[PDB]
Write a protein that binds this DNA or RNA. Structure first.
Ligand SMILES: [Mg+2]
Ligand SMILES: [Mg+2]
Length: 758
RNA sequence: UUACCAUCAACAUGGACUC
RNA sequence: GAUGGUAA
């Protein structure tokens, strides 16, 4: 998986190397003579006989881990506390793991959680926060405190502790006080305000530091009401709180906040009843206040808090390590199992891939250090330009003059790019209702029949009109369309740049080709998949598919597939692949020898399925092409990763440069894979992208796959410069977003020959 | 909707005795 | 989906 083709570079990570002292992780199968109910009794039974095992036992009910080898067979006797039964317990050795074996990993995490809790850091969700850090803002009685997202991973270099910084925001005023203020300002209605602010928001109880999301609020129950506890007694809420925590609810006329189930609860709602009725007096809302959210000045300071340069990130990690080292009990807790952290974050060596060359018609230039070429694209002719001679400009009356300059500005910049433009057909609208827009566009589209593009200027910021326009111009009446918001063309001194960007976007939509990059693999075909998940819900997830259909990767064939269940995804993707190969044969008169797939939108949990089931199913489709066996290469791209790279400058840890590749000591232990940071980072730490090769029948050397990925990162035409993921994946993401969000339908097959989805 | 990037929030994968 | 940053 490791290759070298570029200058070495010294990086550091947010990984602290863990060191194991013994090789003694012995697994034992523990069996009890009678069927023993409840794991607590079993754990106590094992506890009383600790003289045999010791006191470093990690026990979960069936498998017992020890750092010391017992006898081959161990038999012990004990007595039950309830039935006074004679329990003969057996301990038998199962296997001798190495200290880092991917199976003794999920209790090192338990030990670490115990350590962090021993540092007096509260557990909220899955993070460790420090209430003894009260940097207040006192604008809405707010409090921010910092914590860490920490875990113990293992990679092909060994064991590591992955640590990241985070911050939690909590109000000082209780829920009761804020609803009292709400009702204080108004009096007629306290439904809308209190219900909207509370329902859907997440609160925290400080007597146990536990978070609950509040499904509803009822003005119908009081502490005098009661609930059945442990099926033993119907006790009042006041008495239950007093007994468990000894706190008094002062004023009893309040609502109760209902969090009815936690619906999932692992497999399902075995504890279906749920029905949590939290008090409002002892709850505190969590989040950034919306009134604060709208206010810019308040948001500025909090943004300064959240955003950290790599130096501050490294300093926070150093502080955590020093805190762990100082507390002797935490160190003893870690070293009971033989583990011992290092004194600084692990320092690694990556390399910087060579810079690519970008080609335009009659010219070529080597990409600069910062990987951005915005000026050259707008200053020289593109590979292929489509002249517009018949296009319409729809504009409302109030924007009339504001439209004119745009057209004028589009007549001064089309020269350098080599694109030829004629004056449009101006269309002034009687009114701004969406019905008028759709009628006028439909009328010209139906009558003229020669329009090559429709440019619509929207006056007010409303999305329904945009959706209607796109539904008309991409589903019902296929013709490429551009939508311009009047604010963007409202100010001079930015009209030239936006005009150039818009013109390049229209040229791409018409079937143009801006720039290209050298490709060393002959007869290559490149594919990109991506998925879209509805934030609203409705649970229809759309998968977009984009495949190159020429030898320079300047033409694309685009398809989209709609399906909620997983039955039809694979065969619809097979249909898409067959259509793509047929189009490739038609254009080139030969089928591709090598096919590279860049799959995205796959979480870790399904990474095992996609490798084992879906890819052979797709490969089965080549059997309808008369003995045609290509050489496939399939990747899996993960954007959301929690690993940070800091380039080690002579003095402090700085942001790493673009084009950094890492394949050492941090990658997955079973796949071939590598981390690649390609885009130019300006705000924060450099988060790379993880590429996992789940199939390689072409026997491509690692250098070649990395080079091909970096080259494909240069071919996204909506942004001059390198992007995070390969261009086909971003194209698929945009296509899926447009089809699932705006159109609620699949675009007409007439438009799938160009990049209409820009 | 001229774009990209960032925190947040949805989302999806799941993951994990007390009112 | 909000707020902020950046751009011939
Ligand atoms: Mg993507
Ligand atoms: Mg667009």
């Amino acid at each position: 998986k490791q290759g070298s083709k570029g200058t070495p570079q010294s990086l550091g990570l947010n990984l602290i190397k863990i060191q194991c002292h013994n090789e003694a992780v012995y697994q034992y199968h523990v069996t009890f003579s009678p069927s023993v109910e409840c794991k607590s009794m079993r754990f106590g039974m094992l506890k009383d006989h600790q003289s045999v095992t010791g006191n470093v036992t990690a026990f979960d009910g069936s498998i017992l881990y020890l750092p010391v080898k017992l006898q081959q067979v161990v038999e012990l006797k004990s007595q039950r506390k309830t039935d006074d039964a004679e329990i003969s317990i057996k301990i038998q050795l199962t296997k001798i793991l190495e200290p880092c074996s991917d199976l003794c990993i999920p209790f090192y995490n338990v030990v670490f959680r115990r350590v962090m809790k021993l540092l007096d850091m509260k557990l909220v969700g899955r993070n460790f926060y420090d209430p003894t850090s009260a940097m207040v803002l006192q604008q809405h009685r707010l409090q921010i405190w910092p914590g860490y997202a920490a875990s113990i991973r293992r990679t092909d270099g060994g064991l590591f502790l992955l640590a990241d910084v985070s911050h939690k925001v909590i109000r000082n005023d209780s829920v009761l006080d804020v609803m009292h203020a709400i009702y204080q300002q108004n009096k007629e209605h306290f439904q809308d305000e209190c219900s909207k602010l509370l329902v859907g928001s997440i609160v925290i109880t400080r007597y146990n530091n536990r978070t609950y999301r509040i499904d509803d609020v009822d003005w119908n129950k009081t502490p005098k009401d009661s609930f059945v506890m442990s099926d033993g007694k119907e006790i009042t809420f006041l008495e239950y709180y007093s007994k468990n925590y000894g706190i008094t609810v002062k004023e009893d006329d309040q609502p109760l906040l209902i969090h009815r189930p936690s619906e999932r609860q692992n497999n399902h709602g075995m504890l279906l009843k749920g029905e949590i009725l939290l008090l409002p007096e002892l709850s505190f809302m969590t989040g950034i206040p919306e009134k604060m959210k709208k206010d810019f000045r308040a948001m500025k300071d909090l943004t300064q808090q959240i955003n950290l340069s790599p130096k501050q990130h490294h300093g926070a990690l150093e502080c955590l390590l020093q805190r762990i080292s100082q507390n002797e009990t935490a160190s003893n807790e870690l070293t009971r199992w033989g583990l011992s952290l290092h004194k600084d974050v692990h320092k690694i060596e990556g390399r910087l891939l060579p810079m690519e060359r970008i080609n335009l018609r009659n010219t070529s230039f080597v990409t600069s250090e910062d990987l951005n070429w915005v000026k050259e694209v707008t200053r020289d002719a593109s590979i292929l330009t489509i002249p517009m001679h018949f296009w319409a400009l729809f504009y409302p009356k109030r924007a009339m003059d504001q439209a004119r300059e745009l057209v004028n500005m589009l007549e001064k910049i089309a020269g350098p790019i080599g694109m030829r433009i004629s004056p449009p057909a101006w269309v002034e609208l009687k009114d701004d209702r969406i019905e008028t827009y759709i009628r006028t566009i439909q009328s010209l589209l139906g009558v003229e029949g020669k329009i090559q593009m429709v440019v619509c200027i929207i006056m007010g910021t409303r999305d329904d009109l945009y959706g209607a326009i796109k539904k008309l111009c991409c589903v019902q009446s296929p013709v490429p369309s551009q939508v311009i918001n009047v604010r963007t063309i409202g100010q001079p001194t930015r009209l030239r740049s936006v005009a150039q960007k818009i013109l390049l976007q229209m040229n791409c939509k018409l079937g143009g080709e801006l720039w290209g990059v050298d490709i060393p693999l002959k007869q290559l075909m490149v594919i990109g998949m991506d998925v879209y998940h509805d934030p609203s819900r409705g649970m229809r997830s759309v998968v977009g598919f984009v495949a190159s259909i020429n030898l320079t990767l300047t033409k694309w064939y685009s398809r989209v597939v709609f399906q909620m269940p997983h039955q039809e995804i694979v065969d619809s993707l097979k249909l898409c692949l067959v259509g793509s190969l047929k189009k490739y044969y038609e254009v080139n008169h030969c089928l591709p020898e090598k096919i590279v797939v860049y799959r995205d939108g796959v979480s870790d949990g399904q990474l095992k399925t996609v490798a084992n089931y879906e890819i052979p199913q797709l490969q089965k489709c080549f059997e309808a092409f008369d003995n045609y066996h290509p050489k496939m290469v399939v990747f899996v791209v993960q954007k959301k990763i929690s690993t940070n790279l800091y380039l080690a400058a002579p003095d402090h840890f700085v942001t790493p440069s673009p084009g950094t590749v890492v394949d050492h000591t941090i990658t997955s232990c079973e796949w071939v894979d590598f981390y690649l940071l390609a885009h130019h980072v300006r705000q924060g730490c450099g988060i790379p992208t993880h590429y996992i090769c789940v199939l390689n029948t072409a026997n491509l050397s690692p250098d070649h796959m990395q080079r091909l990925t970096f080259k494909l990162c240069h071919m996204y035409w909506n942004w001059p410069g390198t992007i995070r993921v390969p261009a086909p994946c971003k194209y698929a993401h945009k296509l899926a977003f447009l089809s699932g969000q705006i159109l609620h339908h699949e675009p007409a097959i007439q438009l799938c020959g160009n990049l209409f989805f820009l």
